[PDB]
Amino acid sequence: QKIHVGPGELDDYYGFWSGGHQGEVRVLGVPSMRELMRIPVFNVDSATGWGLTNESRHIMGDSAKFLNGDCHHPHISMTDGKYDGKYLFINDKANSRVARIRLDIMKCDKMITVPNVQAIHGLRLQKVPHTKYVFANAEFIIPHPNDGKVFDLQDENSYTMYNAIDAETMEMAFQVIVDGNLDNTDADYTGRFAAATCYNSEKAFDLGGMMRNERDWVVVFDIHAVEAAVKAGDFITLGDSKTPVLDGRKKDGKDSKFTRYVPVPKNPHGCNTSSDGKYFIAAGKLSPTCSMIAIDKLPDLFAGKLADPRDVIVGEPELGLGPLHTTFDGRGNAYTTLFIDSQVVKWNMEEAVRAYKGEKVNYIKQKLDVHYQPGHLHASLCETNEADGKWLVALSKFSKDRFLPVGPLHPENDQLIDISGDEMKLVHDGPTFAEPHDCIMARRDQIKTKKIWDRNDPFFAPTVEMAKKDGINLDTDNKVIRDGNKVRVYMTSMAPAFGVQEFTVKQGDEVTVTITNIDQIEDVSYGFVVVNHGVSMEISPQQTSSITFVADKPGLHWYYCSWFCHALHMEMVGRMMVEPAWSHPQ
Amino acid sequence: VKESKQKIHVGPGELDDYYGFWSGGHQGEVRVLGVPSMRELMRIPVFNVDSATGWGLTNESRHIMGDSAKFLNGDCHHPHISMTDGKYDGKYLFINDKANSRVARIRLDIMKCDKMITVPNVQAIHGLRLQKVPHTKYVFANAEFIIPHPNDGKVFDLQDENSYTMYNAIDAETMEMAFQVIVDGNLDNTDADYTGRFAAATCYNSEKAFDLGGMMRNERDWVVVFDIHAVEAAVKAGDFITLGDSKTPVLDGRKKDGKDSKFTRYVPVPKNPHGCNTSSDGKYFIAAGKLSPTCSMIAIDKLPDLFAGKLADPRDVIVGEPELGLGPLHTTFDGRGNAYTTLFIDSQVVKWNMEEAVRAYKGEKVNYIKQKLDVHYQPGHLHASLCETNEADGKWLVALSKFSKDRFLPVGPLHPENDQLIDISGDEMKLVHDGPTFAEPHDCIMARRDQIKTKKIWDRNDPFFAPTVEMAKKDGINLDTDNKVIRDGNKVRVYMTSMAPAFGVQEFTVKQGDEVTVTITNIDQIEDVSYGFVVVNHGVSMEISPQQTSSITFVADKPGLHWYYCSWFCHALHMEMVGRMMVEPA
């Protein structure tokens, strides 16, 4: 298996890295591990103008006021248990959002603030029959309502909820109140069941209390029961949100019909569905084990045919210190990160199941040292029934001496490991910024991207509607529209000239500049920057972009094209002239 | 015969040989790479807002940024490392912001931006380079765009006698303005000699036009040479004016009715010249011809005669004008007597011998061109290791090309730049690595591993957060031990230590509308154990590395219980390293 990609060779897989608390998504080439693109999501990107342009702020909605995010879990939409390459979704733990990236244009095209929750952490996608729902965990217990009258996590109205977002429309589908809290989550290969780990069964706020119980649980959701109750109208709503809310809590030891709670030690973390669909596998973290939930025993569990919820556990292998996450090679082996032991341990799932029944068998196959303290890990296509067992990425949290010193703040170390053979082989150390937690890989042939924007793309359709209200045809017009103290400039662009090279406004006017790149040549992107006004954005071929700013400074103010586009790039400029307020009324 | 056969692979547990400091381009940051692996080791926020570390949100960063903290964007091009005696001394990195007219300084011991200045009375800081000898006393910065003085909206004519741009000198150590020199025309790139007396800058708009054709009209623009000693003499003697409300000494470097200033000479050079590069032997300022398929070589040792009036014609300091190819933009040096120039149109790097080009200029029939190497595609800057020092070592060359086209996996309409590593250690340039990068780094700079010395943990007296230490002192707080909430009207100042896995203050209560400052001191002494702080749904995020104090201010505008958490995976109990802010209503 080739590990080095030379000049003119292409990578075999795409990798989509979370940006961690930096807030973007990063597109890597695998196995070269080089970053091919950055996709801004919750960060403000000076380069493309994401967070500054009207198109991006419209997508972000009211949350456009935040300049930060904290993202952990990117996942690719699926059809029948295989990636279909349409969308990537990812969480924001810092401001409680889910974002959708359209994989044809590699941009964030939708974003939602999950109502009535704090901190979206775990996120995974329904597999079968396709990604109808995005499942998302709200991690922190809060009062409901959270109006500052009650603060006690022990109140009967303090809780967190499990969230289902409609993948296609990116609106809330439903929420399920749970006991405890929620950490990570995954879904089965039938569409009936999802599952989530919980570490705060104690509903405590301090360290000791959160560690009190020897077992917390994996909570299992019967999605068929939730849907049926939603169609029957058997639900409530919270606050101002119309989102159907179902109660998945136990009431006096009686299970709800939407959930079952399977006791699992201890403050368990990762929750990973095996690629053969047999198991939800929960990483024990404080317990040196993983717990294997047999998915084909879940119907019986939900029909009362099992005396004890532990009866769906068919394995609990002892692996090592600090198990956090598990992935799959498609050959019947599972790979689990041991954070404290700083290793990846490869183990055979059916043999672990044998050992649970007593048939003493050594299910552990290999322990590979990693550098150092691994969190998530990801084997190529591991979330699909096409898991190909070629590559494994272990994403470690301390790099220490593995890279040149760069000051007190160190990079992370995401290590590429060959798993095509029987022995795991460490091949490459990839330093990364801001702590990617998880990543997802896809074959090169599973992703199909556009090289030119479509002119009706919804990303900027609101801007086209604006232009229409002004009588503008964006493909041809270079016009300055005046409207009271608003000025709407529309121009085309074709290197090395802006279609409008100067315009005049009044001091204090609110200026919107809308630019359509009418070039057809791939890779010929233009930019637009207004000097000393904090204005910057990208316009790629056939895209329309716009940005609004206040002309608060009189005098002559240059704008220029930021994207090197032509030998005469330095000369693709224009001038905004701002007439002073003392020469205009008031 | 010596062949180019340097190793390019840096396997797990091996370390790179050189640091690379990349401009972040339109994205606004500085990036630290390892060479020859070309992996990004660290991101240093400068003009961007970084969600991960909180640069742009924290009080320490907004203090350094000053009033320009209101801007969320920057546009970088030219990173340069301070020198002593014509060799890198590893103290500081400087870089420009073309979008909002700033210069920033990065301290290479902590790899943080520690000072920032908005250059007064100019628009668009583009070209930037450092004094070399006797050390980097001055940062030289080009303001690209001609503007009226005053720019108060009375006069817009760029042909007005008070419309001009200025060459800028910043005190490298204080990061205060040293002086400004008014020039004719505009300014593109700049470099400095090896004595400290001279600096030079290309100018592409000798015609002071606003339109593309207008600024290409002159057969020749020029490189303007500055007699820095003479400027210093005038400043020391008080022979200067000031502009507007800036106390910066302003000297007039324009021609006056054909009469030369004492501070400048204009050397005619074809045509819209771009790069301005000092050869590592100190003999030449080399201007890349852009529209002219040439470079022009100015003999620095003829400049004293030029300013003394001994030379008949300013063209007499031109000692070579080799013809290289279409679209010369920039030049670098191997320390062996060869120059290497990017050919933007021909899409090549051309290697040529400077002394042979000088002899050809006299009429000798000698081919100074050694090799043309195809690059992919349209190169702008290029950089050979240690090229800006008298230690130029002739080992590595990076060419930073603006169109990557098919050299990487497609990632949608926006493509990465292609920064290509080229082995120049031998007689033949050899292309060895294609490096995709985001947002158009324009230029980069390499330093030997042993030229950079970094801190492993913060010093408690570090100037970076000295203002915060001063605030704490006013509140009577010992930041190394104290965990306290100070109430001051509707202001609340929380001070806490932190030690994984617990915040030193795990809950506090405020009134709705209070302005909350949270100051956190990481008292861990273990390298790499960084902590974070995020307030859920409040747009609040920051890094606290070992022995650092960081602080951030936000208004508690939402009643209820609001969780905060450590964003930096730091401990097996990371998930449980949390606290609660309780906000009382009404």
Ligand code: CUZ
């Ligand atoms: Cu957010 S947690 Cu193991 Cu996923 Cu990193």
Ligand code: CUZ
């Ligand atoms: Cu700003 S220009 Cu050839 Cu330096 Cu990139």
Ligand code: CUA
């Ligand atoms: Cu348009 Cu560069």
Ligand code: CUA
């Ligand atoms: Cu503190 Cu993770």
Ligand SMILES: [Ca+2]
């Ligand atoms: Ca627990």
Ligand SMILES: [Ca+2]
């Ligand atoms: Ca010109």
Ligand SMILES: [Cl-]
């Ligand atoms: Cl997981």
Ligand SMILES: [Cl-]
């Ligand atoms: Cl240059």
Ligand SMILES: [Cl-]
């Ligand atoms: Cl040579």
Ligand SMILES: [K+]
């Ligand atoms: K880390």
Ligand SMILES: [K+]
């Ligand atoms: K580009």
Ligand code: NA
């Ligand atoms: Na939305």
Ligand code: NA
């Ligand atoms: Na300053």
